[PDB]
Design a binder for this molecule. Structure first.
Ligand SMILES: Nc1ncnc2c1ncn2[C@@H]1O[C@H](COP(=O)(O)OP(=O)(O)OP(=O)(O)O)[C@@H](O)[C@H]1O
Lengths: 78, 83
C-alpha cells in the first residue's frame, strides 16, 4: 500500500520589466528635448516664411518701377 | 486602576446540531460594533507560494490601523472561524 499522491504549488515568473526603467527615462528625456527643438524650429520657420513673403512685394515693386522707367526713357528718347 | 487586559478568544465544541453557529451569529448581532468578518472553512488556501499567509494577515489590518490611530479609544472587531 505504498501508493503515494501529490499536490502542486505554482510560482509566477517576474513580469516583463526591470529593464524598462533605465533606458526608458533617458528615452523620455531625449524625446522631450527633441520636442522642444521641433517647437523652436517651427517658430523660426514661420518667421522666415513671413520675411520671404515681405521680400516678395518689394521685389515686384522694383521690377515694375524699373520697367516703367526704361519704357518712358525709350519713348522720350526717340 | 486594576491594570488588566481583555480576553480575545472563544472556542465552542460539541456534537452536531446543538446550537453553536446560532450562538456565534447571535453574539455577532448583539454587540454594537463593525460587521463581523466570517471565514467559511478553508477559504484561505491559494495555489501560489505565500498567498495563503497574505490572506490570513489581511484579516488583521483594520484592527491594527485603528489601534495605532485611536489607541485605547477604539471599537471592537470580531472574527468568526467556521470549522
Ligand atoms: N438551543 C437551541 N434553541 C433553539 N433552536 C436551536 C437550538 N439548537 C439548535 N437549534 C436549531 O437548530 C438549527 C441548527 O443548529 P446549529 O446551526 O446551531 O447547528 P450546529 O451546532 O452548528 O451543528 P453542526 O455541527 O452541524 O454545524 C438552528 O438554526 C436552530 O433552528
Amino acid at each position: 500500500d505504498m501508493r503515494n499522491e501529490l499536490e502542486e504549488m505554482q510560482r509566477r515568473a517576474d513580469q516583463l520589466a526591470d529593464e524598462s526603467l533605465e533606458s526608458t527615462r533617458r528615452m523620455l528625456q531625449l524625446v522631450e528635448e527633441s520636442k522642444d527643438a521641433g517647437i523652436r524650429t517651427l517658430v523660426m520657420l514661420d518667421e522666415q516664411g513671413e520675411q520671404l513673403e515681405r521680400i516678395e512685394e518689394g521685389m515686384d515693386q522694383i521690377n515694375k518701377d524699373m520697367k516703367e522707367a526704361e519704357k518712358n526713357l525709350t519713348d522720350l528718347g526717340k | 486602576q486594576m491594570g488588566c487586559k481583555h480576553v480575545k478568544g472563544i472556542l465552542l465544541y460539541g456534537p452536531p446540531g446543538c446550537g453553536k453557529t446560532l450562538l456565534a451569529r447571535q453574539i455577532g448581532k448583539m454587540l454594537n460594533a463593525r460587521e463581523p468578518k466570517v471565514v467559511n472553512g478553508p477559504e484561505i488556501l491559494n495555489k501560489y507560494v505565500g498567498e495563503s499567509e497574505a490572506n490570513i494577515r489581511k484579516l488583521f489590518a483594520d484592527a491594527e490601523e485603528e489601534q495605532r490611530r485611536l489607541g485605547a479609544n477604539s471599537g471592537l472587531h470580531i472574527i468568526i472561524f467556521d470549522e
